[PDB]
Design a binder for this molecule. Structure first.
Ligand SMILES: N#C[C@H](Cc1ccc(O)cc1)c1ccc(O)cc1Cl
Ligand SMILES: N#C[C@H](Cc1ccc(O)cc1)c1ccc(O)cc1Cl
Lengths: 224, 10, 219, 11
C-alpha cells in the first residue's frame, strides 16, 4: 500500500538464516562444494516463499514468476550474502557456522576469484553505509528488474517508490538523495557480474560431477 | 517442475 | 567543470557516424562495424575528462570489460526513433526477421529491440544517453580514487540533466531509478552478444579483425 | 596485437 507498508511487508518477508555446519575436517573441493550447494538449495526454497510475499508478485502470470526467479536467483542469493557479511569485514557469512574467507576459497579451483568479487562488493556497500530498509528494497528490485507485463512495471515502480521514501527518511538534501539512489543502483551491476561469474563456475562444477543431487538447485542451474 | 510446485501448490 | 559543461564535453567526445560500405553477409557486416566502432570508442573514452589520467592498466580494463555494452547503448540511442528496426548504421538497418537468418541472433535482436522500446517509452533524451553511456564505461568490472571521482562527476551530470526537465523532485528520483535499472538490461544483452560472438570466433566463421579479436580475447 | 594500447597512447 504506502511505501512504509511495502517496506514493513519486505522486512517481515525476509527469510530466516539457513543453518549449515562447517565440515569437521579441513575443507576439500568436495566438502566445500557440498556445503555451498546444500546451502543454495535450502536458500532457494526460502527465496520462493519470500517472492510470494512481495505484494503483487503472485498476481503475475506463473510463466513470468518462473522467468524472474530463474533469471535472478543467484543475484538474490549474493545480495543476501553481502548483507549478512556487511558487519564482518574480511569474512563471507554464508551461514552462522559457515564463515569463510579467501583461506577456504583455495579449496575449490576458481572460487577464490568469486569470493574476491563478493568481498569487494560487500566493501562498497559498507563504505556507502547501506541501511537495512535500503537492502530490503534493493533485493526486491534485483528480482523484479531481472497484462502481467503492465503489473510487473507497476510492482517495480512501487518498490522503487519505497526506496526513494527510505532515502528521504535520512533527511539529506534532494541532490544528495539522488546521488545516494544512483550509487546504490550502480552497485547492482557489480552484484550481477558476481552472479554471472558464479553461475558459470557452478555450471563448470556440475560438468565435472562435483555437484550432488539437489533437485531445486539443479532445476535453477539448467535454466541457464 | 519443483519451482512450479513451490510457487503454486506450497 | 559544471555538470552542464561536463555534458558538453561528452557531446564533443561523441564518435562520428560510422557506415559499413559493405547469413554470412549479415555477420561479416556486424563484425566489420564492431571493429570500426571500437577505433572511435577509444578516441571517445580519451575525451572523457580525467580518463587519460587513470593508470594505463585501468584505462585498458574499463574498455575491455565494457566495450560490448557501450556498443549496444549506442545502437539503442540510434534505434530509439525507428520502432521494429535496429539502426546498426545507415547502410545496416536490420529487423527481427533478418535476425532469423543466423542461429542465436534472433534472441539478441529481440532483447535489443525490447530494451530500445523501454528507452522509447521513457522518452530517453540525448544528454541522458551521453551520461549513461559514460557511466557504463566508468562503472564496469591513485587511479581507483580518480575513477570513483570521475564516475561521481558523470552521475552528478545525469542528476543535473534530469533536474533541467523541470518534473517534480519525486518524478526526478523515479526517472533516475528507471534509467539506471535499464542499464542492467543493456548488460544482459551484451552478455548474450559476447557469448554468441565468442562461439562464432571459436568456429572461425567471422573475419580476423585485429582490434575486435583483441577485445574479444579479453573475455 | 596491442592495438588498444597503441590507440590509447597516440592521436
Ligand atoms: N559464492 C557462492 C555461492 C554460490 C555458488 C557459486 C559457485 C559454485 O561453484 C557454488 C556455489 C552462494 C552465494 C550466496 C549464497 O547465499 C549462497 C551460496 Cl551457496
Ligand atoms: N548485436 C550486435 C552487434 C555485436 C555482435 C554480437 C554478436 C555477434 O555474433 C556479432 C556481433 C553490434 C551491436 C552494436 C553495435 O554498435 C555494433 C554491433 Cl556489430
Amino acid at each position: 500500500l504506502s511505501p512504509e507498508q511495502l517496506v514493513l511487508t519486505l522486512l517481515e518477508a525476509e527469510p530466516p538464516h539457513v543453518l549449515i555446519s562447517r565440515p569437521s575436517a579441513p575443507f576439500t573441493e568436495a566438502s566445500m562444494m557440498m556445503s555451498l550447494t546444500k546451502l543454495a538449495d535450502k536458500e532457494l526454497v526460502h527465496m520462493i516463499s519470500w517472492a510470494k510475499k512481495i505484494p503483487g508478485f503472485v498476481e503475475l502470470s506463473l510463466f513470468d514468476q518462473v522467468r524472474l526467479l530463474e533469471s535472478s536467483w543467484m543475484e538474490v542469493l549474493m545480495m543476501g550474502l553481502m548483507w549478512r557479511s556487511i558487519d564482518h569485514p574480511g569474512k563471507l557469512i554464508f551461514a552462522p557456522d559457515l564463515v569463510l574467507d579467501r583461506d577456504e576459497g583455495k579449496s575449490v579451483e576458481g572460487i577464490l576469484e568469486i569470493f574476491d568479487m563478493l568481498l569487494a562488493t560487500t566493501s562498497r556497500f559498507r563504505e556507502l553505509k547501506l541501511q537495512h530498509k535500503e537492502y530490503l528494497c534493493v533485493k526486491a528490485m534485483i528480482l523484479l528488474n531481472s497484462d502481467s507485463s503492465r503489473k510487473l512495471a507497476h510492482l517495480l515502480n512501487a518498490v522503487t517508490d519505497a526506496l526513494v521514501w527510505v532515502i528521504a527518511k535520512s533527511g539529506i538534501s534532494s541532490q544528495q538523495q539522488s546521488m545516494r539512489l544512483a550509487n546504490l543502483l550502480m552497485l547492482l551491476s557489480h552484484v550481477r557480474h558476481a552472479s554471472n561469474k558464479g553461475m558459470e563456475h557452478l555450471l563448470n562444477m556440475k560438468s565435472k560431477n562435483v555437484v550432488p543431487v539437489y533437485d531445486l538447485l539443479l532445476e535453477m542451474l539448467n535454466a541457464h | 517442475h519443483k519451482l512450479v510446485q513451490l510457487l503454486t501448490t506450497t
